[PDB]
């Protein structure tokens, strides 16, 4: 049958494995990456944001970006053949059509990559945990690049694909959402930092508990991929941390599973937080402290001090960050401390 | 053709095209001048 | 010279020179050449881009201010009168790098692989405690002599630049260096915290010259000591005696010295004259309070009774111990001392009457100059805070010097930790991993 | 004066560029080099001379 | 610089970078011998 | 040995446009406002 | 494996006979793509003299969705 | 002005040239 | 004698928690800092951190929760001055001027420094390799940066990171305004360190979990397939390599476990090292890239980029932070 014949070629043992997923993955991923490189080099953002965002305009690697469509576009798909671009490639790039081009092909690209993980794992004969662990980066991309702007007024307030544009996304969430105060991001931070901790503490432990399986100072030559014995001492590693830290791993399987659980869970928690923020359902305030502060002008915490900062960010960044609102703030209404 | 020659030539070519970009940051567009 | 025979990979290839005195000698001399090379090439570079009438700290110079501090090519106020001494220093250092570069290469790729059977005097063994202290002694004497060169320069050959010189900064000959051990070693016993500042707080050239006199004689005497003596019993049992172990001891030393240098160039304005390096952090901040005190007082403001938003004095307030200080956020910098501000300083701190009547235009010029040249700049050299727009191309030399030598000091601390840990393991015999068959833990009683 | 100064200074640069390449090649050289400590001693003693010459002729041109 | 040494102005603006090239030269020599 | 493969296409799909872009960006460094 | 080693190809004469022309030409192609000003018109990217009108301070911002293409064209005619 | 570029040319190639010369001569590399 | 018996117990490898000579200093300093921290976090009165007689409440009893609670840094009037308990006329004065903060961070940094040295010590007592303490130097350096180095460069312990959740945030926000840390490569390397670290953590964890050799049944946990102290590996590194080696391509995968785990250690430690140095170098005001008004049109008009939008945000933080502390137009300290 033609299907089994095509199947044979798709999962051929070549340099770059293709597979049935490859039909979805490789084109979508290529158009996502290639779209970003095309946009940060030539395409502008002058009509959508009133900003320069390409190398052609004089931006560098940090300031270039494929910027989001204008707020007037709403949650439009902004297809090239759509009612907005009307088949005009030039106008398409000017209306921010590249953003929805990268976000969408990138979305199906992530699907194709995870499907690749499932497909290869089945062929090799291993368990699909690497695929399962990849569900968190997907949850992050979907919640932030898709769900969040879907909750808001348009694609405009989604992240623009750029280094500085992402930094702007961070500061926006502070001033408007007070995103740091949110217990879901806090758990996300503990997942990332906790993961980096585990990553560093496991790699250093293994390297410093190695058995001597050679006589070279460079101990990398003393390992063989087909050996049966362990390359490092679990018993010695266990006693070290038991005396140093109090507790220690004694099971290699639970250990590596824990290295899966911690960062995956963390990114899943932060995704839940963003989904809330899509509806401006934030952890912005503590009511008990606002009541106290409003009644007692001598009550001050680091919480109240941060709110003053957020109000500053909002009033000072909005007229240029949201040009479609046509904000005009006279100098006298601007929130300012003394002197500064 | 020795690989170390290929890697070195390509390596020097990488440095040149990058040094041109840092050069470009101080002249023309993106120079703030 | 490969991994199978030496036991080291290519990324650790310089660790093959541990027991090869000959090639190792060539390595150090060649690296020394690189040092003297840069010291000369950069000098010539700085001089090539140098503009006489334009301040040194506005031209991104670090080496020329060092030469200038020694009294070469400068005059009253730190003004450049002759660029020729800068040229000599750059040329001589540069030419010498060819000499060190010649023997560095010779001793490395064709000099005897080992010095031990070319010469018993030059040949050495890392574990020979007598030979090591002797070499330590020789180089101790060399360091002692170098310290006396600074003394000789300051007392016999022109002198140094005194930023505290009467009538304004000028080159001054030090005739009475401080020999008092209550002063010299008094610095060494000072607190590293605010108001004290350890040895960083040295504010006169007399203490500097007199200090280098002490450390000069101490290194020479110490040099003679370690040459004639052999390590005592308590010292032999305390340290690890090997090539890598000695390296780690020096890595910890340079790391400490790196951190000390970082604080010197950032806080001290005596050995690092503000006329050359630009104002210090504390200095610039105090100058702003100085600048607007003068401006407002000219408008008719009584700066002594001017209450601020918080209730504290807007221009003038008190330190925790009662000293009259500059108000505002600069209250933290009330331990700053500079020749442009001390004329206004009385027994209880800032004298308001001296402030009202005795402030001179040169003080007003210097204040505005140092205020607008505060050590705040971006990585791409945009002067001012982060929110400042592109216009001024300026980052203070103090920032470059403080940041660079902190990065180096920290990494050399890591170097100390890395090379000392391995030196312990190697000398004990388990740096290559645990012997599968004498696993020490398995012979230990369970923790629970 | 300048006629001799700049010549000795330009030759010092050229000689150095030869020495920079020549010396390490001559050392790492298996055969072929009874040939060359003559030229090592050649350029070396000639290098020191030019340095002094330019160093002396400097005060007559600046 | 003195006007007599204005000849080597382009040469002077290159000299400081030379030490860094020695670090890169070590990799060339190692690549030449195939990282033994 | 095969000259043209799937790996071959996979390379040039990134390789060819990369050099094109690198030439373009290099030319951008000589733009005056 | 199955495919020819990269180290074998990039160190072969036949490779560099080809890529001594292909690589520089594509570099030239990209160069000409910008120097001819083709890049500007293809992607509609504003030239240094095409951002504001001579006496204009306002951003040509797209305010409508279905008349977006017409609005930009209006901006392009005015500028 | 591009005497600039001529200096870094000869200086920059001076390093690898030694390696190339010691290779064709099969020296002690 | 009873001195070497003391030295034997101190360096004893048979204690439930290893003491050691580093631990001789570590234990009292950590206990002093911990005890003081717990007490201060709950009951300490408001602290005039900015030295402007504007006390900030940080403890639970004075109107805080776990999130808003903090041990407030010492006064700006103090600056870098060493301020122990015996340098105050009373404990009431000591608490008002941010006394506890100094006692905590000083005993902590010393205890934490000895903690690192202690790690080498036990590793040397157990015949291990000693570079575990090197990996710990990265978070330790980060601690020194926000508690010591940055206060030194800025000239005040009031600008040190507060010991509190919300206080930490305040430290971060003000930092961005005055240094543009996001546009600094060292923090970007640090983000790459922790993002990459988390990635490689989840990566190595999932690939080993997938290669676990079947030793258990359907009705029991797979973790029981590994018994503590066994000599043979519990997973198939060859199968793992063949999976990941096909996920990307073969030579992008590690076949050497020792080389693999070294990469797992190297990447985050190096990344955190730089972000530690980032805070440490920005302590001397070597700030992140300033690309404000970098793009200009033919006439001269400023064509904004995303950096200009970032700048507008920094302006908001700048003019609002410490709203009563500044009397002069420039923020130098
Ligand atoms: C091995 C032995 C270890 C022993 C450890 C236990 C002993 C404690 C060591 C110090 C610990 C840090 C204390 C704070 C250091 C500091 O605030 O240092 C500041 C002082 C300078 O202080 C300043 O000194 C100034 C001196 O300038 C004065 O005098 C000048 C004269 O020109 C000018 O006139 C100027 O205007 C005037 O103010 C003033 O006194 C200021 O008030 C004062 O703040 O520098 C100095 O003492 C230099 C010495 C300290 C260098 C910094 C150390 C950094 C270590 C980093 C560790 C990283 C760990 C990583 C692990 C992974
Ligand atoms: C497989 C790869 C793949 C995938 C999944 C996508 C997916 C997408 N592309 Mg992309 N694209 C791809 C490859 C792919 N593209 C390639 C290779 C190129 C280069 C030529 C492009 C070029 C491209 C452009 C230029 C654009 C997109 C856009 C899009 C989006 C809109 C597409 C759309 O509306 O299609 C609609 C059509 C289909 C989905 C086809 C459905 C066909 C059905 C199944 C036939 C059914 C027949 C029926 C059973 C017969 C019954 C007979 C009888 C019984 C009655 C979407 C996210 C747009 C975008 O993102 O705009 C912002 C856009 O402008 N793509
Ligand atoms: C200690 C500091 C710290 C830490 C550790 C974190 C940690 C985190 N933050 Mg938080 N944050 C912080 C401070 C911190 N934050 C502060 C102070 C603020 C200011 C309020 C913010 C503001 C903030 C925002 C606004 C957001 C986060 C988010 C996150 C999460 C990002 C996860 C991630 O890797 O996404 C990275 C992205 C992905 C994993 C998606 C998939 C990416 C694909 C796989 C990339 C493919 C690349 C391709 C193959 C090749 C491209 C090549 C090309 C580049 C050349 C994570 C939980 C995000 C979140 O919550 O998301 C749910 C988010 O949107 N933070
Ligand atoms: C400061 C830098 C420095 C220095 C001084 C040295 C010095 C040395 N290394 Mg080391 N090395 C370094 C950096 C350095 N290395 C770095 C960064 C790496 C990592 C890539 C290595 C990796 C490495 C390895 C893997 C090995 C060495 C070895 C050696 C020794 C023998 C080299 C040899 O025979 O080369 C032969 C090379 C040549 C003959 C080519 C020419 C070399 C010369 C020096 C060029 C001089 C150029 C200069 C312009 C000449 C000016 C002349 C005059 C005008 C002044 C030598 C003592 C070897 C060793 O230990 O042997 C026992 C060894 O196996 N090194
Ligand atoms: C770190 C310094 C150092 C040391 C310890 C050695 C040690 C050695 N060299 Mg080497 N050498 C060095 C630097 C050094 N060299 C340099 C920089 C050069 C380039 C000029 C050479 C060039 C060189 C050659 C060409 C030869 C040696 C040889 C030798 C051996 C015999 C030396 C002898 O008999 O000296 C005797 C010297 C004296 C009795 C007096 C020397 C006085 C000096 C030059 C100046 C003293 C004043 C003061 C210290 C100068 C300081 C300058 C600056 C640092 C401030 C020995 C293994 C020989 C060898 O190994 O043969 C097989 C050999 O042929 N060396
Ligand atoms: C480069 C400098 C240098 C070096 C590397 C050495 C190295 C050595 N010396 Mg020598 N020495 C030097 C300079 C140096 N010395 C000089 C210049 C003198 C003249 C004053 C001496 C006088 C001297 C004597 C008299 C002795 C040595 C001895 C030793 C050996 C043991 C050192 C030891 O245990 O230290 C470690 C020191 C201790 C463990 C003691 C406690 C040190 C405290 C904790 C220092 C605290 C410093 C503080 C944190 C910061 C400084 C500020 C302030 C408090 C001072 C060793 C071979 C000993 C030996 O065996 O000789 C044969 C010996 O008896 N040296
Ligand atoms: C076969 C494979 C061939 C390669 C395929 C590669 C595919 C992936 C492409 C990745 C693109 C990476 C970013 C390119 C940046 C660029 O081109 O800058 C191009 C810019 C152009 O520089 C700008 O030019 C302008 C012209 O008007 C102005 O002159 C500006 O002032 C000037 O700064 O250069 C820089 O900004 C500085 C150098 C680049 C700094 C990059 C830092 C490193 C980023 C790494 C991120 C991960 C990448 C992983 C890659 C593996
Ligand atoms: C040496 C070059 C600079 C190294 C910086 C520090 C890197 C290693 C730090 C490890 C800390 C983790 C905890 C201990 C982890 C641990 O214990 O490691 C164990 C691992 C095992 O090596 P061996 O014990 O066999 O070798 C030790 C010696 O005997 C030499 O063989 O050590 C190394 O591989 C060191 C390799 C250094 C040489 C390669 C360094 C590559 C650095 C790349 C720099 C990139 C710069 C650009 C960045 C933007
Ligand atoms: C859009 C679109 C599309 C697409 C297209 C494409 C896909 C393109 C691509 C393009 C591309 C694909 C491009 C590429 C580029 C690349 C580049 C541009 C690169 C660069 C690089 C660099 C720059 C590097 C750097 C560095 C690093 C990173 C490392 C080392 C160091 C250095 C710095 C050197 C189509 C038509 C389909 C359809 C329509 C729409
Ligand atoms: C061992 C080894 C190594 C290293 C080596 C080295 C490091 C060397 C060095 C070398 C050197 C360190 C050299 C130097 C040289 C120098 C010179 C050669 C100089 C010259 C000068 C001049 C020529 C001057 C001139 C002039 C005058 C006279 C006046 C002014 C102006 C002018 C500039 C014109 C390596 C790693 C690579 C590898 C192998 C092993
Ligand atoms: C003083 C003087 C002089 C001298 C000079 C010199 C001494 C020079 C040297 C120079 C040098 C000494 C150079 C070197 C260079 C080197 C290089 C430029 C290298 C590069 C490398 C690379 C690029 C690599 C790459 C690679 C490989 C191959 C492996 C790994 C991977 C990679 C791809 C990274 C003369 C005579 C002129 C006269 C005037 C004055
Ligand atoms: O204390 Mn904490 O935050 Ca360092 O900048 Mn100035 O001072 Mn105050 O203002 Mn911004
Ligand atoms: Cl604040
Ligand atoms: Cl103020
Ligand atoms: Fe593992």
Short mmCIF file of C-alpha atoms and ligand atoms in Angstrom, two decimals, chain B residues 4 7-8 11-12, chain C residues 37, chain D residues 13 16-17 20, chain E residues 11 15 18 21-22 24-25 27-28 31, chain H residues 11-12 15-16, ligand 11:
data_model
loop_
_atom_site.label_atom_id
_atom_site.label_comp_id
_atom_site.label_asym_id
_atom_site.label_seq_id
_atom_site.Cartn_x
_atom_site.Cartn_y
_atom_site.Cartn_z
CA UNK B 4 42.46 23.58 10.70
CA UNK B 7 38.29 26.49 10.47
CA UNK B 8 40.78 29.34 10.87
CA UNK B 11 36.87 31.84 11.93
CA UNK B 12 38.60 35.01 10.77
CA UNK C 37 53.80 44.72 25.82
CA UNK D 13 59.69 47.72 11.91
CA UNK D 16 60.93 43.01 13.51
CA UNK D 17 58.22 41.58 11.24
CA UNK D 20 58.51 37.84 14.60
CA UNK E 11 50.08 50.96 13.51
CA UNK E 15 49.14 47.11 18.77
CA UNK E 18 47.95 41.87 19.57
CA UNK E 21 45.70 37.22 19.11
CA UNK E 22 48.11 35.07 21.13
CA UNK E 24 43.65 32.74 19.45
CA UNK E 25 47.02 31.57 18.14
CA UNK E 27 43.91 27.37 19.23
CA UNK E 28 45.36 27.50 15.71
CA UNK E 31 43.91 22.70 15.65
CA UNK H 11 49.90 41.58 11.82
CA UNK H 12 46.88 39.28 11.95
CA UNK H 15 50.54 34.41 13.53
CA UNK H 16 48.93 31.70 11.36
C1 LIG J 11 55.11 44.91 18.23
C2 LIG J 11 55.35 45.20 16.78
C3 LIG J 11 55.39 44.19 15.90
C4 LIG J 11 55.05 42.83 16.37
C5 LIG J 11 53.80 42.39 16.28
C6 LIG J 11 53.39 41.04 16.73
C7 LIG J 11 54.21 40.28 17.73
C8 LIG J 11 52.27 40.53 16.21
C9 LIG J 11 51.74 39.22 16.56
C10 LIG J 11 50.63 38.84 15.94
C11 LIG J 11 49.96 37.56 16.19
C12 LIG J 11 50.48 36.62 17.24
C13 LIG J 11 48.87 37.26 15.48
C14 LIG J 11 48.14 36.02 15.69
C15 LIG J 11 46.92 35.90 15.16
C16 LIG J 11 46.16 34.67 15.37
C17 LIG J 11 44.89 34.58 14.94
C18 LIG J 11 44.23 35.71 14.23
C19 LIG J 11 44.17 33.32 15.20
C20 LIG J 11 42.86 33.20 14.98
C21 LIG J 11 42.27 31.90 15.29
C22 LIG J 11 41.04 31.53 14.93
C23 LIG J 11 40.14 32.45 14.16
C24 LIG J 11 40.59 30.18 15.33
C25 LIG J 11 39.46 29.66 14.87
C26 LIG J 11 39.04 28.30 15.28
C27 LIG J 11 39.89 27.26 15.22
C28 LIG J 11 40.85 27.12 14.07
C29 LIG J 11 39.89 26.20 16.29
C30 LIG J 11 38.71 26.41 17.23
C31 LIG J 11 37.47 26.75 16.42
C32 LIG J 11 37.62 28.10 15.75
C33 LIG J 11 36.70 28.21 14.54
C34 LIG J 11 37.30 29.21 16.75
C35 LIG J 11 55.77 44.38 14.45
C36 LIG J 11 56.75 43.27 14.08
C37 LIG J 11 54.53 44.28 13.58
C38 LIG J 11 56.42 45.74 14.22
C39 LIG J 11 55.57 46.82 14.87
C40 LIG J 11 55.54 46.65 16.38
#
